[model samples]
Target: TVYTFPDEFKLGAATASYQIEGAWDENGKGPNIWDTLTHEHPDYVVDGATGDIADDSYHLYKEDVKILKELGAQVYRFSISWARVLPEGHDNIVNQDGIDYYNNLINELLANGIEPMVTMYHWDLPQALQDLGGWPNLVLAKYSENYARVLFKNFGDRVKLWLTFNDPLTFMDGYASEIGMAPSINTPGIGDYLAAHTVIHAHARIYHLYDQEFRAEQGGKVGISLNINWCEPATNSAEDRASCENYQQFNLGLYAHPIFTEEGDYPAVLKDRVSRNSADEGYTDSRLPQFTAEEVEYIRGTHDFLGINFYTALLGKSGVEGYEPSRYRDSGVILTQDAAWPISASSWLKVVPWGFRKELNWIKNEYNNPPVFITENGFSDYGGLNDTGRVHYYTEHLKEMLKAIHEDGVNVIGYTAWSLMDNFEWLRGYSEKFGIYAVDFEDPARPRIPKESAKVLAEIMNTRKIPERFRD
Candidate 1:
């Protein structure tokens, strides 16, 4: 069946400041963590490739808006480099050049009849902030509040949808636990927890700041983007189901629950299990930190909507254990992928359309059916213009998403494809290309070429249905 979107549904593409806007230290910009990590510790990246010159979007943003206009996007979601706006990563120094750059981009996007959906932070903390102990430091929240206020004061007049951070779990856990991305720390379970705790507060504070200062006049919605690797039970047994829930709570809920849930605390399943695990590990106290009562209320109901970045799913079973006290051990779930499922250029992302439906339902059931925006969803493949794999991936995933919205009654309002054009893919570097547009990384001009998937996306946008070319 060919599925169609409701008329109000928004179609757009997403971009992060660090991934695509590669001015690095140009034009009064300060160094970000990625800049420091990729340049200083190239071994951490698989391809030893850096985003120092990725897409050249700083100079080529006009071309970017042109592409979005041609694609017929209703909205354009992009991140502003925090270090660029606040050159010292502190309030004392505001960079006029940086503000003017985004002002031009936002003005250009609005003039083209596209709504600007701005993400204030997208995993590119200034290196100076990291030097001040990064996410683990309580001062980080204060800095974030100041930074958010700056953005609100400057850009909130035009930008109606605001995302505080993209994928807090990835930034906090992946970086701190040495599991996924850069600035790989050795502090396993504890560091990730600490970072999550501080970040939730930072997000909540930003929301309140916008609500208090800017919302009345600017009238924008503030939320956070969480990337969830949907955990499916390996079997129908209750034990396996419980194990899978534990994994989701540990990975996704840790960041989501504080802002989305009624209680404004960690999920009970997560709290009990983590406490039990800490007792078993002979810790004198729970490694998982507790929020004060005031903090709980302060963070509660902060989300105007939920921004989700879903790529793939993992099947979970009982009896998973690792020596380290990371997400793997705490959740007590052994995750494995089905051999039958098709794969992508990125080994971790497998095609699982059914899992997408199940995950949306999970969010609906757990969070009282909060409004949802798919902030990032797409497939990655080797560099090519004829991207049949990506087209197929998008078709299947959109079909499942439509089922969730129409059949299952999930309140998903918008869908932003994972990326607008090819850029740096973090530790995998440029090797895993997820963009609908093919980027010529070798060219000095940084040409943006549309792939087959981009054509399919354009059709989908215009007709509000699966493109006939992709419809079987």
Candidate 2:
């Protein structure tokens, strides 16, 4: 089965600031929550490894871009470090070196005929902002807008595609669990919901700011990147099916519904379950925050496109099992994976290509076939230049994505591989590598060597079709 992509469909690679860029506190850059996490609690990360000098991308961005060109990548999706640009997480104090660093990177990409897709936030909130209650504070919504203004003012001209956030669902867990991520506040249901509420508002605020202030001159688009594993019913029973639906509503739809749907608000299942559970937990109000009428309208239609980061699937059953007031309990779904599925270096990720097509169809039906950009999708493995597993992973996933576009008429417009080179994997640290190009963390220069997957991806990009050997 040979698959061909649409001519206009883009193929590229992605990386995040915290994950890739090193020199964490260099060039007047302030410490972010990740820096604080690894510094304050070394054991929180495996191997006590810090990204302080992860890939040294700040100094070696040209090498990164050179690889992108070699791969025939059409676009490069990288995130901006919030604190690097705005030291205190406020726009008042701008970092000139930080500005120059990104400026050089963006120019390098353009010179190589590659587009830049910039994510404004990728979970590295400045420690200063965490001091002020972080994303849980509504004030950060305003502050996020201010930060977007700085980005737009500086880079919007060359960078036309903008993603306001990179997977809020993953990052919001930072507040939900004490051991989750940086600024690991343990308010559980309360903190997670509050962080999401403010993040949605922040996304909309940034979108509106771009629309009113920068759109005319820049001609750019704004959206948020969301991640979700496909939820397969554990059984064909009605209750199991319903549980799977509820899981999607509770996770992906939590953010997508308010922005992408015709009616702008949290999913009814989420609102009702949390509200009912709040009463049971003896809380005066629902743990999930509510949006006023005007606020709902403001958030509605806030996206120019939908950015999706899909990796794997989970089998869901109807059950209530988690901390009493946690999101998992409220969702009433027990998620697990089939032991038969192929496993990756990351325990949570299992090979299930069909899930990718199903997830795309689900999004298309749920969001009225909006233009979709696959912001991040890849396989993780322990370090290897041969990387046969990653090659298989990409081939299978790309086939499913192609099927979605051609057979199901999904609106997927672009696909960016999860990473250009391996760097620090949060929690797992550098142990689990997702890069097609392996980075030599052992060496000071951090040289990148192309893996088997990188060569395969380059062939796919050059031909705009699955390679003959990969075809069935």
Candidate 3:
């Protein structure tokens, strides 16, 4: 397969604010969920490493930018620490320290000629906001928009790329799956739906603000960085094929359909099926809320581009056994999870490369083909750079990327690997590694060392720009 991206495409790496920035409370930095979780929920992190001091980047971002220069990264994908910026997630007062921190990072990157991509929220809502029920509360959306107005007024002058949210689907599933992410409220399926709607409202408000107030003069592009994963069918069985779509719709469609679909509603099947299941289970209102006409009109075309994150996917069905007595089985679409799949890094991560192409095509067909950016894509392993498993994962995935771009004309614009170095990987701590570069935990400096994947990626970024650089 050919592998060399067109020269015009951009390449970079992504990291979240909570995962890498340390000095959590230094210089007036406030408590984030991660800060509290590490301090209070000490047992949660496997290695006992709290992000409170991760990378010490809060005080050393210039050094991190130097690493980006070393990697020859043309763009750097990062998020604003909402907790640090707003302390309690409101606009009543500004955090100049937070402002100074980001502005400094932005200026340094610009000075070095690297473009900045800013994500307004990367799951780090102020912990105090979590006390107020977090995203589940509709007020957070309005609060977020007003907070975003502050950012637009502050950073918009220098930043060209601005994104609204990382991915709501991941949060929604965690809510239902009993996986504990911050603001962890698992009221089953409805909690997931309601939070997602609120996130959309938040996103639409910011997009509108930028569209009406900032875009004309700022001349910067804005969109939501929706992180989604896709899978392929295991066999020719109609059940398997249908299951693939169901999981995708329930998982990805829940976010895209509301904004991407012509109708501007939650996926019809997902909304109907989930509601039907919830009602049968004695809930009067569909656990999933429906968007009002105005909300739909506002959210429908808010994105200038789509950001996708792909990892291991399952090529199986959510079969009858996997199906439950309730909406938990309601994918909004018929897909079921296969009990068996090849194991990879994250306990939940399964390797399914073809899902990349299949899902890209699905987005094209479903969302009217908006410009797509592979914001986060990489494999994770618990070991060293000799990590051929991670290398092979990239090989197969790059092949899929080649197919999606060259053969399908899917409107993909760029590709960014998940990370540059390993940091506090939420919940699991430092147990898993998804980085092209590795970080030594025992070392006080936490020195970064290039992995085989790093060499593979560096060459891929500089030379291949897309046609299939690794097959050789």
Candidate 4:
């Protein structure tokens, strides 16, 4: 059966500044953590690929918008490179050239009748800021607030939706801990929590700034984007159930409960687990920092909406003994893979569409049914124009999202596909392509060739109907 989206359900595509805007250091733009990481540690990146000139969107944003317009996109979600706006990564001096670049892009999108959803940060912290302790440092929170005010004063009149950060957990837990991403520290439990806590305070500060200062005049919304990958209990056993719950609370609820729920603090389960783990590790105090009463109040009810970046799920079980202690282990769950599940080009991304409905329901029941935007959800392939796998992936997950919205009564307002075109995919680099439009990175022009998945996505966005081919 063909499915039609709700009348007001917005559709768009997403990209980060570092991933697409390749002019790494042009027009007064300063170096970011990504520049240093990919340059200094070339061996760490797949194929030694870097974003030095990934898509050249820095010079070709008009073409990018033209591509989005052709897809009949209503909105476009893109991030601002902090260093691009403020070369020093501080308000001491602003880069007029960088500001003009974005102004032109924003105006270009508006001229094309496309709304721009801006994300203030998307993992490309200015290197100068990173050198000064980055997210783990309390000073970063103050800088983030200043940066938000700068954006609001400049683009708040045109940009209606703002996301403070995209996937804090990914950069905190993955980049700083498990994975060797930029700012790779490898201190899982301590580093991840420290980094995330600073971002939480930063987000709260910016949200309040907009709510009190800009919302009155600009009439825009501000929120944070969390990348939540559902964790399912491996069995009906009590241990597995507890493990699943622990993992969910640790990863998902840690961010959501503080701001979305009435009681503004980390989930009790998460705090308890982390506290216990810290004691086991012989720490005098909990590694997970405690929030003051006033801080909790300040953060509570800060979000105008919730942004979800969901792509996959995992089956979780109680952890076995003698494992290394880390933030992931703090979840008290052992994540296992299912061979039966179809996998994406990225080895970790397993296509579990039913998990999407389950996650939506969980968010609804846990957070009092706040407005949610599917900020990032899409599939990846190695390389192909006939991306039937991705097409099927979108159709299946979208069907579950429809079920959640219509049958399960979830309040999902919009869906932003993972990206508009292939880009530099972090450590995996260009090996894992997640875009509807494939980019020929071999060519200097970085020509964007539309794939079959683009046609499928465009049909859904333009007609609001899942064609019979997608339904199949």
- Against the reference, the lDDT scores of all candidates come to 0.88, 0.94, 0.77, 0.88
For model 3, how many clashes?
A: 18
| lDDT of each residue in 236-278, candidate 2, tens digit only | 9999999999999999999999999999899999999999999
Q: Rank by lDDT, highest first.
A: 2, 4, 1, 3
Better of 1 and 2 by TM-score: 2
Among residues 3 or more apart in sequence or in different chains, the pairs in candidate 2 whose N, CA or C atoms overlap within 3 Å are: none
**lDDT per residue, candidate 1, 385-468, as tens digits?**
999999888898998999999999999999899899998989888888989888899998999989988888898999899866
What are the per-residue Cα lDDT tens digits for candidate 3 across 199-264?
988888998899888999899888777665676666788777777777767777777877777688
In model 2, which runs have C-alpha deviations exceeding 4 angstroms? none
Model 3: which ten-residue window has the lowest total lDDT? Answer: 319-328
- Model 1 TM-score relative to the real fold: 0.97
Candidate with better lDDT, 1 vs 3: 1
For residue 443, model 1's alpha carbon misses the true position, in angstroms, by 0.4
Candidate No. with top lDDT: 2
lDDT tens readout by residue for model 4, 291-313: 99999999899998999999999
| lDDT: worst 10-residue window of model 2 | 1-10
The number of clashing residue pairs in each candidate reads 0, 0, 18, 0
